[PDB]
Design a protein around this ligand. Sequence first.
Ligand SMILES: [Cl-]
Lengths: 98, 99
Amino acid sequence: PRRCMRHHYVDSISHPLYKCSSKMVLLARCEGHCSQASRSEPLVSFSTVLKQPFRSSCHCCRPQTSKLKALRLRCSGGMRLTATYRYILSCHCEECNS
Amino acid sequence: DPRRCMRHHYVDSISHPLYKCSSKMVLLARCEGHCSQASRSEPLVSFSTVLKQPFRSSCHCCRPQTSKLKALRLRCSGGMRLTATYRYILSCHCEECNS
Ligand SMILES: [Cl-]
């Protein structure tokens, strides 16, 4: 089966540079195999050599809708610091380059 | 031999989209298949104002790996000679959507 599904997991958010207390939060990701085949066929040009010579279709498992989240970290030096990220609510198969 | 990323041959009629021309039949190739790799998309974290692209993604697509540039002269009604170009695909493979 393993089609484009939404998946829950937990992770701990840290600042990549500063020293802060790890806060762990529930996240979601999209993952799976879109059923549609991907394809790529040549375009014909009477004007120029084509910068992009190919017409293609490719479906990828991506977030369809998501909710923005804020997160404050207790960072050393009495620093309060805030992080943003998007909690994924639904996933779908979507064209690689819309 | 499953339905994976590979080359397919077909003959196609080349014609100008605007001008009247004597069409030419040519052998073409395209890529088509199902890459084994699962696609995925995860949220990114940022301490700036919200990120414009909030997700890091992986997605493999069946694309031309190698190709040969072709040209073709079409005879057209106005006595005009029109030259088309296209790429003859030589090999296909699964490649990341972004690049
Ligand atoms: Cl010529």
